[PDB]
Amino acid sequence: ASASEQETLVRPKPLLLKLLKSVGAQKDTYTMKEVLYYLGQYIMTKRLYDEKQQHIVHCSNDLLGDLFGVPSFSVKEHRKIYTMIYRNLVVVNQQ
Ligand SMILES: CCC[C@H]1N(C(=O)c2cnccc2C(F)(F)F)CCC[C@@]1(Oc1csc(C(F)(F)F)c1)C(=O)N1CCN(c2ccccc2OCCCC(=O)O)CC1
């Protein structure tokens, strides 16, 4: 039913929802594009990167690390990022 992969509708699981809402997300249902956007807002506000290597997120002592299950990851490794995000949501229908 989704018009594109980025437009897949999802319901974040409770802790990922808590995380997204902490950075101004007002929804309960999001597109995958929106989840990436709000994760980005979270990383930027909490400064979860080293100014030296901006492509590496450091999250070992943060909820982001607990939910993704890693102490750090590369923003370039999209496959790994999708895998970690998917474990924290449920796919929903357009109704
Ligand atoms: C490039 C300028 C915005 C990104 N930014 C920096 O890269 C950046 C800047 N200055 C200092 C430090 C950083 C740091 F984030 F990398 F640590 C700042 C925040 C928004 C920003 O990055 C991320 C959003 S969600 C995310 C993460 F959880 F880590 F995976 C990273 C961003 O919105 N995206 C767009 C989404 N990307 C992504 C990631 C995974 C899969 C597919 C992706 O993309 C597909 C195509 C885009 C589309 O979804 O339609 C990753 C980058």
Side-chain angles (χ1 to χ4, degrees), residues 1 3-93:
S4 78
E5 213 90 283
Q6 283 298 108
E7 296 301 273
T8 293
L9 299 171
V10 305
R11 276 198 210 119
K13 288 175 180 179
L15 300 191
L16 179 60
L17 189 64
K18 168 195 171 190
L19 190 154
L20 305 170
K21 288 193 177 174
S22 83
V23 287
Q26 270 216 275
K27 317 169 102 229
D28 296 297
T29 301
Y30 299 74
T31 62
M32 276 302 294
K33 200 188 270 171
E34 283 169 337
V35 173
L36 293 171
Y37 180 76
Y38 288 110
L39 284 167
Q41 299 297 260
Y42 185 84
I43 291 160
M44 292 310 274
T45 312
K46 286 196 100 173
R47 289 125 73 169
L48 302 178
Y49 56 92
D50 52 307
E51 193 70 13
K52 181 164 60 65
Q53 244 182 335
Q54 288 180 354
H55 77 275
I56 303 295
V57 168
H58 292 286
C59 50
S60 71
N61 197 25
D62 195 88
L63 181 60
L64 180 61
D66 305 319
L67 302 180
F68 272 17
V70 297
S72 61
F73 62 91
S74 165
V75 177
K76 300 189 180 291
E77 299 189 288
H78 294 180
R79 152 222 287 109
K80 289 188 184 178
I81 295 165
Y82 282 124
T83 300
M84 292 183 297
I85 289 166
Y86 293 154
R87 287 176 185 179
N88 288 281
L89 56 85
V90 305
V91 183
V92 297
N93 253 337

